[PDB]
Amino acid sequence: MRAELNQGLIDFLKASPTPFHATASLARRLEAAGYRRLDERDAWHTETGGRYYVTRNDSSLIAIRLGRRSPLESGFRLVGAATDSPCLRVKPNPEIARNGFLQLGVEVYGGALFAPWFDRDLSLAGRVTFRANGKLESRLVDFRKAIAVIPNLAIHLNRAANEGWPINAQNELPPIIAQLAPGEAADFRLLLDEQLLREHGITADVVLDYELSFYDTQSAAVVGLNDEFIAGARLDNLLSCHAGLEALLNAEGDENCILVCTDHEEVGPFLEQVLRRLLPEGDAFSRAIQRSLLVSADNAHGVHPNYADRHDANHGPALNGGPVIKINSNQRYATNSETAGFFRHLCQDSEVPVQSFVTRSDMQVGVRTVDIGLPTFAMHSIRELAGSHDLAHLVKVLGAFYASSELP
Amino acid sequence: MRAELNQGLIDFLKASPTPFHATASLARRLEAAGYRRLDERDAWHTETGGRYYVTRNDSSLIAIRLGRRSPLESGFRLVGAATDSPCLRVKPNPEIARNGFLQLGVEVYGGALFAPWFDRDLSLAGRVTFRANGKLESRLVDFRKAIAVIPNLAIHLNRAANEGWPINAQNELPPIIAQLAPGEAADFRLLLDEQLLREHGITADVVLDYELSFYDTQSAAVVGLNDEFIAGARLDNLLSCHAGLEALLNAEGDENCILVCTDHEEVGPFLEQVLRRLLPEGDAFSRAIQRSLLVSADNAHGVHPNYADRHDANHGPALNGGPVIKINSNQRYATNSETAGFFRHLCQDSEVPVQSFVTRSDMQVGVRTVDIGLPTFAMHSIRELAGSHDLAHLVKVLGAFYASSELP
Amino acid sequence: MRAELNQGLIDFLKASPTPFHATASLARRLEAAGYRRLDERDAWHTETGGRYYVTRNDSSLIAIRLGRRSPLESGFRLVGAATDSPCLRVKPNPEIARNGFLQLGVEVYGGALFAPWFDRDLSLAGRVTFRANGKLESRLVDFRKAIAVIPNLAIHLNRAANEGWPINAQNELPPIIAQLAPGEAADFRLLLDEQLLREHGITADVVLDYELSFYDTQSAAVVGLNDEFIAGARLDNLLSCHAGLEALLNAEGDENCILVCTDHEEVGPFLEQVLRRLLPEGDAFSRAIQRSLLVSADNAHGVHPNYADRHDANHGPALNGGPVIKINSNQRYATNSETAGFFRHLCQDSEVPVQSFVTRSDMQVGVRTVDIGLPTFAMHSIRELAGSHDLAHLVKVLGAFYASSELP
Ligand SMILES: [Zn+2]
Ligand SMILES: [Zn+2]
Ligand SMILES: [Zn+2]
């Protein structure tokens, strides 16, 4: 009955096909749990048992739980995750008409693995910006249905397929969405127009621009003979968003708690401007920050039994082995002996197994940070694999971290 | 309401994860339509309005519809397709235990594209041979559940991923099915033992050998903005089996009709031995054969708009453009001007659009044959794409071919 | 020491330098055992207890042991093996005279390893066809004596020898047989005439053509500290013929048994044409074959300790660990779950150890078949290696199979 955390992750993933949808999903959960939306344009009146959230660009979210003592005296407990994932995005003048098809040109967002996007039943979702009633508006759309596919070329016509080839993103990625009669005109913006109507019944004067991503229509799922795994797109990093949320809503204590889920992690001012607004002027920010810690959550690489030499022999985390503390001496404000020690101890105290990762050696707010993540395979594929046990481990330790009244 | 042929193809695909399952599915349909199973070990007593089928190795099937005139006088109308597909098969001593996992070693069956098998939710099915009650038996098993996955290595640990690499089948294909405690023993045959019990409640003395294939648990489906496509594994060549069956069961007339669906097309005596048993001794076979024609059905390559130069400019068949007559002057008993002309005319007469294919030029019973197929993309992927209109076109023309009382 | 027991195998190899001699040796044993030679030119009358054999081109052989019940009722038990091996054959106009030598030009028959043929004491044998007393005649000859050598080049004149070089079969394989005075004429046909007279007391008017193979005069031998191995030329595949013959002569029971030893396995009508003559016309043949099984015996590869990575870690057969069941899903009428299962149980039941092989994944009559072989090293060398216990294991199982009244 971490069956429930896992079911919740699956539903969150299905409701979050783009960073915008992930943000709106997080906002629903928070609104249902009593968090008040603050608007950055307004002056804020916050207080000591207060429960708040704020968004920017409708794609980034910070949730705030103010406790009994002020951040000056007790610091903030912060958990960081991200709302974006590497994917394929529709270009601005996208219509491609060849060999009787309609295709949409795509931009590669983040460091996607290309090959797995092929031969998948894809749909399309995101923000559309348009003019209605002489004013500018945006809405989210999700076609939902499998409207697109990027087919492989038959091995018969590419006989060295398995020997590998540099996949050209410009040429081989544009998905097929339909057939066109000769020579029907193709207007993608008209299709968005229809979709706005069908989904929200709005009648746009003109559709201006959009940020739309393809995504797999096949749901995340528990896989394995004995259900040891979860497979799904966007585990990087919606897995961590979900954990951080579950921990935030359920944590005990009365500490000052922050969940930051930022867009564009795959491509700082937001967090800073928000935290400063919760404190007096002067030395209070710097002083509260020096009593704070950030648990920066972002999936780690499990050691893959078919590519085991890609890991250091002594640092191969296992799926269902718990969260992984990520060490890289070549970063500032990364894991250090103090932030790692704190976090490792926190796991021991909660009886949550915990692991370590560094790489093979041949391969700003100023807050103390520990970098952790759940171990996974196939990072940046359209379908990643995590352990089915690990989400409950992370939720527990993050709960203890938010309830934790003393920091190092 | 070719919506119905397409729904039927989807269900046939779901019920046919291996050539054995495809064969048992075809046999159910035939048995329900009144066809009698003949057994090759017995003497046969066949007759003029008779409806029969026969199987070999439980993986190949021939269905026979004898008409009013004998094959000596009117020939046979034969349609050929295949029950197998390229896939991954479990090796005989398969258990691999590394980094805390259980994996099963795999053999590559046919010319599979490797990359698409990665990051898919896979299950396992096939024949298991065993000893129960002092006698040798076989049964089909299908675990059904997604018990296995072949994960990609993260792009972070293989940064040139997209530039391509020769995928090593021995090393990179073995699927993960479970986690093992150190050092639980792993017995795959015990797992088959449990599965026999769970699925058929049989208690084997010993499990001897098996022929088991992994397969995608994600169902075939209609995809496209306007439903122009079907995506699914095993379209090569269960698409043609289904068409040939639907045509056989529904065709008018009273001609001698044969559907041959053979195993191992991907890796002759069967068909021959069967046909000879339907005729007297002497010159009757050779004479009936010279009045017969075989429509050998096997998917063709549509021209792919992202790889259009892989086709000859003048011979790019289109999805939903109808069946494709396949010309290759470098084969004997392949399409020729007579068998092609016949078939093209048959399409014209039935108002079924029809197309032609040859390749770019830089790339035995003795029966007259025409080679046709529906156009598709991604042949030998784990998920292929066909047109949603084409199955109805093929079923109609094949119906007319079986009802057709004069051959060239 | 002892023990050995492989003496039968050694003597059979010694007597069988070519496929013709292999056939004559099998024929003489069969005759002495009371098997009657059928001539394919004549009408045949066979009877329920009958013992027969038949040859073709004097180089293939089929032995037949008819049992109590007809093949229609009880099937055939067939064992298949082959009479040929890779070797060097003399060309039709072979005399090469250079630097004072007579050499004979050779052609490479089969996939021979070239290097082992060097620096060996070779003799020559096979079929000579000639004309005497106005009739066409053929006889076998065997010079016996070491009359030929293919010497290496001194390392001093080829200092990078051990780095390897592509051996050119046309220039480096021709064997040296003698020295020629200036400018003595060489006539190879005259030498054959002498050898025909010596061996058969016959004088040819003219020697026309021949099929002659070089072979090693060094007898097969048991080798190793505890006599673990047998070293000899032509273990592929005379090892299987011998085991097949031993099993056929000594088998108990009253089943229909076939032994098929064919020429040209090193790259099906004979067998079918013969089996059809053992049956009535009509459906009998096909019904008898659907009750039959073929054990197709051809040496397998043991995992070699100096080149272990050429095998799958899990499917490395051991010399002296018994018969190997060879699995390759990429064939029709090859080992399958039923034919493997049957054979495996038969081994367990005869207390014969049994093994499985598939390769690394990165490397007719329509009878059910199981492909098996004894494990060996150095296949296709002039001197191969097998295990000295493995013959008995094979003979015991083939015997149980020939006795085995209950087939699948
Ligand atoms: Zn990422
Ligand atoms: Zn195919
Ligand atoms: Zn060989």
The answer to whether the CB atoms of B92 and C338 lie below 8 A apart is no
Residue B70 parent element (H or E): none
Residue B16 phi/psi, 5-degree rounding, is -130, 70
User: Beta C368-373 vs C293-297: how paired, if at all?
Assistant: parallel
Neighboring chain C residues of B171 at a CB cutoff of 8 Å: 362
Residue A187 parent element (H or E): none
C-alpha–C-alpha distance, residues A266 and A111, integer Å: 7
C-alpha–C-alpha distance, residues C275 and C348, integer Å: 31
Q: How does DSSP assign B81-111, residue by residue? A: EES---EEEEEEEEEEEETTEEEEEEEEESS
What is the per-residue burial (b if ≥16 Cβ within 10 Å, else e) of B64-92? bbbbeebbeebbbbbbbbbbbbbbbbbbb
**Best interface-test mutation with C: which of B107, B168, B187, B277 has the largest number of C CBs within 10 A?**
B107
Radius of gyration in angstroms for the set of CA atoms belonging to chain A, rounded to a whole number: 23
Is residue B399 a contact partner of residue B346, using CB atoms and an 8 Å limit?
Answer: no
Q: Give residue for tokens 């528990």.
A: A222
C-alpha–C-alpha distance, residues B239 and B218, integer Å: 17
Name the token pair of C363. 């490397």
C-alpha–C-alpha distance, residues B224 and A117, integer Å: 16
CA B44 to chain C, closest CA, distance in angstroms equals 8
C-alpha–C-alpha distance, residues B383 and B113, integer Å: 10
Name every residue whose Cβ is closer than 8 Å to that of residue A228 and which is 6 or more positions away in sequence: A319, A320, A387, A388, A389, B178, B179
Neighboring chain B residues of C337 at a CB cutoff of 8 Å: 126-129, 138, 208-211
Neighboring chain A residues of B231 at a CB cutoff of 8 Å: 119, 121, 146, 149
Neighboring chain B residues of A308 at a CB cutoff of 8 Å: 98-99
C-alpha–C-alpha distance, residues A303 and B101, integer Å: 11
What is the per-residue burial (b if ≥16 Cβ within 10 Å, else e) of C250-278? ebeebbbbbbbbbbebbeeebbbebbeeb
Residue C191 parent element (H or E): helix C188-200
Nearest C-alpha neighbor of C59 from the set C211, C257, C245: C211
Is residue B148 a contact partner of residue C357, using CB atoms and an 8 Å limit?
Answer: no
The answer to whether the CB atoms of A179 and B155 lie below 8 A apart is no
The answer to whether the CB atoms of B118 and A174 lie below 8 A apart is no
CA B137 to chain C, closest CA, distance in angstroms equals 8
Chains B and C touch (3+ CB pairs under 8 A): yes
Query: Could you check whether B1-85+219-408 and B86-218 share the same CATH topology?
Result: no
* CA C398 from centroid of its chain's CA atoms: 17
Is it true that domain A86-218 has CATH number 3.20.20.210? no
Is residue A55 a contact partner of residue A273, using CB atoms and an 8 Å limit?
Answer: no
Q: Which amino acid is at C72?
A: L
**Best interface-test mutation with B: which of A114, A122, A168, A176 has the largest number of B CBs within 10 A?**
A176
Handedness of CA A271, A274, A279, A280 (dihedral sign): positive
Q: How many Cβ atoms sit within 10 Å of the Cβ of residue C14?
A: 15
- Neighbouring-strand partners of residue A34: none
- H helices, E strands: number in chain C: 10, 20
User: Residue A353, exposed/middle/buried by CB under 10 A (0-12, 13-18, 19+)?
Assistant: middle
DSSP state of A18: S
Nearest C-alpha neighbor of C204 from the set C214, C196, C213, C212: C196
Residue C137 phi/psi, 5-degree rounding, is -130, 155
C-alpha–C-alpha distance, residues B109 and B169, integer Å: 11
Nearest to C338 among B109, B129, B263 (CB): B129
The answer to whether the CB atoms of B146 and A384 lie below 8 A apart is no
Handedness of CA C314, C315, C320, C325 (dihedral sign): positive
CA A155 to centroid of ligand 2, rounded, Å: 10
Residue A281 vs residues A284, A286, B85, B207, C69: alpha-carbon distances, Å: 6, 10, 70, 76, 106
C-alpha–C-alpha distance, residues A217 and A163, integer Å: 29
Neighboring chain C residues of B128 at a CB cutoff of 8 Å: 337
Cite the beta strand spans of C8-165 per DSSP E: 36-37, 51-56, 60-65, 77-82, 87-98, 101-109, 122-132, 135-142
Question: What SS3 state is found at B55?
Answer: strand
Name the token pair of C332. 């029709």
Nearest C-alpha neighbor of A231 from the set A79, A44, A109, A381: A381
Chains C and A touch (3+ CB pairs under 8 A): no
C-alpha–C-alpha distance, residues C307 and C384, integer Å: 16
Is residue A8 a contact partner of residue A246, using CB atoms and an 8 Å limit?
Answer: yes
Cite the beta strand spans of A193-344 per DSSP E: 206-216, 221-223, 229-232, 256-262, 293-297, 300-301, 324-326
The answer to whether the CB atoms of B153 and A118 lie below 8 A apart is no
Name the token pair of B388. 């949603």
Helix axes A390-402, A337-349, angle to 10 degrees: 110
C-alpha–C-alpha distance, residues A155 and B110, integer Å: 11
Nearest C-alpha neighbor of A354 from the set A322, A391, A388: A322
Nearest C-alpha neighbor of C290 from the set C344, C365, C341, C343: C365
CA A285 to chain B, closest CA, distance in angstroms equals 36
Q: How many Cβ atoms sit within 10 Å of the Cβ of residue A112?
A: 22
Is residue A375 a contact partner of residue A209, using CB atoms and an 8 Å limit?
Answer: no
State in Å, rounded, how far the first CA of chain B is from the last one.
33
Nearest C-alpha neighbor of B271 from the set B254, B296, B252: B296
Name every residue whose Cβ is closer than 8 Å to that of residue A362 and which is 6 or more positions away in sequence: none
Name every residue whose Cβ is closer than 8 Å to that of residue B221 and which is 6 or more positions away in sequence: A121, A146, B10, B230, B231, B232
- Neighbouring-strand partners of residue C206: C131
Q: Nearest 5°: CA angle at B41, between B37 and B44?
A: 60
Q: SS3 for C134-182, per residue?
A: CEEEEEEEECCCCCEECCCCCHHHCCCHHHCCCCCHHHHCCCEEEECCC
C-alpha–C-alpha distance, residues B326 and A381, integer Å: 37
Helix axes C235-250, C390-402, angle to 10 degrees: 50
DSSP state of B304: P
The answer to whether the CB atoms of B91 and C362 lie below 8 A apart is no
C-alpha–C-alpha distance, residues A338 and B296, integer Å: 72
Kindly list the partner chains of chain B, i.e. chains with 3 or more CB atom pairs below 8 Å: A, C
CA B81 to chain C, closest CA, distance in angstroms equals 16
Is residue A78 a contact partner of residue A293, using CB atoms and an 8 Å limit?
Answer: yes
Break chain A into its structural domains and give their ranges: 1-85+219-408, 86-218
C-alpha–C-alpha distance, residues A143 and A213, integer Å: 11
Q: Give residue for tokens 């923000």.
A: A127
C-alpha–C-alpha distance, residues C342 and C67, integer Å: 21
DSSP state of A149: B
The answer to whether the CB atoms of B383 and A229 lie below 8 A apart is no
C-alpha–C-alpha distance, residues C344 and A26, integer Å: 59
The answer to whether the CB atoms of B162 and A114 lie below 8 A apart is yes
User: Beta C375-377 vs C384-387: how paired, if at all?
Assistant: antiparallel
Could you give the count of Cα atoms lying within 13 Å of A401 in the half-sphere of its Cβ?
Answer: 39
Residue C368 parent element (H or E): strand C368-373
C-alpha–C-alpha distance, residues C322 and C391, integer Å: 8
Nearest C-alpha neighbor of C266 from the set C62, C124, C81: C81
What is the per-residue burial (b if ≥16 Cβ within 10 Å, else e) of B304-317? bbbbeebbbeebbb
Name the token pair of B287. 């004479």
CATH superfamily of C1-85+219-408: Zn peptidases (3.40.630.10)
CA A303 to chain B, closest CA, distance in angstroms equals 7
Residue C243 parent element (H or E): helix C235-250
Nearest to C286 among B110, B273, B281 (CB): B273
Experimental resolution (Å): 2.4
CA A265 to centroid of ligand 1, rounded, Å: 7
Q: What share of chain C is helix, strand, coil (3-state, %, to 5)?
A: 30, 30, 45
Name every residue whose Cβ is closer than 8 Å to that of residue A329 and which is 6 or more positions away in sequence: none
Residue C4 vs residues A317, B393, C16, C177, C363: alpha-carbon distances, Å: 55, 70, 20, 35, 37
CA C287 to chain B, closest CA, distance in angstroms equals 5
The answer to whether the CB atoms of B105 and C290 lie below 8 A apart is no
Nearest ligand to the CA of A84 is 1
Q: Nearest 5°: CA angle at C69, between C68 and C72?
A: 155
CA C21 to centroid of ligand 3, rounded, Å: 18
Q: Give residue for tokens 């590559």.
A: B108
Nearest C-alpha neighbor of A66 from the set A52, A78, A56, A80: A52
Residues of C with CB under 8 A from a CB of B: 281-283, 286-287, 290-291, 312, 314-315, 325, 327-332, 336-338, 340-342, 344-345, 348, 356, 358, 360-366, 368, 408
Which residues have CB atoms below 5 A from the ion given as ligand 2?
Answer: B 236
User: Residue B189, exposed/middle/buried by CB under 10 A (0-12, 13-18, 19+)?
Assistant: middle
DSSP state of A162: G
Residue A262 vs residues A58, A266, A296, A357, B302: alpha-carbon distances, Å: 10, 10, 11, 24, 43
Nearest C-alpha neighbor of B193 from the set B123, B128, B121: B128
CA C112 to centroid of ligand 3, rounded, Å: 8
Determination method here?
X-ray
C-alpha–C-alpha distance, residues A343 and B262, integer Å: 61
Q: Give residue for tokens 């699956």.
A: A10
Neighboring chain C residues of B44 at a CB cutoff of 8 Å: 283
CA B156 to centroid of ligand 1, rounded, Å: 9
State in Å, rounded, how far the first CA of chain A is from the last one.
33
The answer to whether the CB atoms of C341 and B96 lie below 8 A apart is no
C-alpha–C-alpha distance, residues C320 and C353, integer Å: 9
Is residue B230 a contact partner of residue B220, using CB atoms and an 8 Å limit?
Answer: yes
Is residue A168 a contact partner of residue A179, using CB atoms and an 8 Å limit?
Answer: no
Q: Which amino acid is at B12?
A: F
Q: Is C186 left (phi over 0), alpha (psi -120 to 50) or beta?
A: beta
Is residue C237 reached through a cis peptide bond, with omega within 30 degrees of 0 on the bond before it? yes
User: Beta A206-216 vs A122-132: how paired, if at all?
Assistant: antiparallel
Neighboring chain C residues of B267 at a CB cutoff of 8 Å: 329-332
Residue C377 phi/psi, 5-degree rounding, is -110, 155
